[PDB]
């Protein structure tokens, strides 16, 4: 919604393409776009129709097409089978310094989750987290990050709560981080990188390999809006998790809407890799 | 039989009503049953669909492939959760046991670095083969060794050279990456069926990975696209991406039969989640 130039259609209406312009018609008007303008596309309702040439050309610009509910809230998205000098840079990324900025990204999410256990008062439960931050070694093989999500979700959402189906809490959090998925894919994309190859992982296929690792600290953004909502209906915490997108964060001295943080985030954990581990970003809760 | 799949490759309309794709071009219209349909491939530039056919599509779970000007796949339909009747096999889901998760994801491991022996062996590459085997039968529970990865390097390294050749010199890796991501949305829409999450797997558990559970069930069939890539080292991408598309309607050897690609997987994935319902047993094998 906010922040990355974003097209709402909400209304009854035909999209189409031509002359490197989003092209939409409706009963009153016709309007034209140029597609290098937009971030989001947003198709909200099911009275509209397009064409598979501007699907094409969305993908082509790297544009985030996603297709909503009956609500009207985010639901599927395009995606592509296969999104500078980016890709030659990246080859000539040490092990060193992949290893070194991965667990400094990782050790940004163990500190939010931390932070978050302390803005709720679990200050005993925070403390233990505080403390797998401080003992994080080099690719964390002791499993600390696991260590410290088991005591932080279970914290907030009770032991063994995977097993409740009656609260349907982790398709809420699966579905959160869908959405910063997304938009961290996206920036990996543009930044020219290879999407696949992350900064650990490297035995299983993932075409998001390298966003997953990039998102991480930003997870507990999700985690706070479904445990506020926690005893609602999924539809409502979807609802709530949307206005993420809309909401200001705080980061690098500024309020900032977060499709910008994103993007900023981004290309600056890949800037950092370009230069050796230094300046890596850092997102704080 | 092989999955239905609905290929539109004409000026045309699609649309949605009573339960219906509505499918009009210059020669016909067409009024299809939506739950019948499997696969829907747009392959040409020039189709109009909307918005309440493709909701009604990730309603139906129908797996959406849109084309190029080449008609080759460049997207596809993304649903950001699988729609399920029934929580019955989420709460199943929940509740496996690390004993047999564990032991399920090793056995599947297993498939695939015998797979890829096996298809070293095919190219006459007789020596790193065998070491490869030799990884095989040394293989444990989880492969906390990381095994694994040393049969990949092995592998991958013979077939196709060092990074600068998978990256710069020949489009190996974009050929593969392309290809595994084909592969792992037939996965992913089995899973989905099954009535399990796709983004909770055997073994990784920490960063987000929508595809998770999928990409472990597909672990075996990995090297059918190392296979056609390798065939194709030598060609442009454009050629390597048309050869990996023949995925959803080429037949291979499975239960000592041929079968279609498509009803190979939605067995085998089926038969996981059985699997991994009962204790770990009866997990199903696929072979090069």
Redesign the interface.
Known sequence: MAGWRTVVVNTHS?LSYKNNHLIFKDAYKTELIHLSEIDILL?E?????????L??RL?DENVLVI????KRL?????????GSLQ??KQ?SWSETVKSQVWTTI?AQKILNQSCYLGACSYFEKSQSIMDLYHGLENFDPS?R??HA?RIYFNTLFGNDF??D?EHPI??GL??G?????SMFAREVVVSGC???FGLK????????NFA??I??PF?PLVDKIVYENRNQPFPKIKRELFTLFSDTFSYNGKEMYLTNIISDYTKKVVKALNNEGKGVPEFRI
């Not at 981080?177 to 998925?181: D, F, I, K, M, Q």
């Not at 992982?201 to 998001?208: C, E, T």
């Open positions: 035909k198709l309702t099911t009275d509209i129709v397009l064409s598979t040439m699907v094409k993908v297709f909503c509910d009956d985010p639901t599927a998205m395009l995606m592509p089978f296969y890709l030659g080859m990782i499993n990050e696991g999500a995977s097993r189906l982790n398709a699966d579905y981080y869908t959405l910063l998925l290879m999407t696949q992982h490297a035995n299983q296929f993932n075409q998001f997953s690792d998102m991480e997870r």
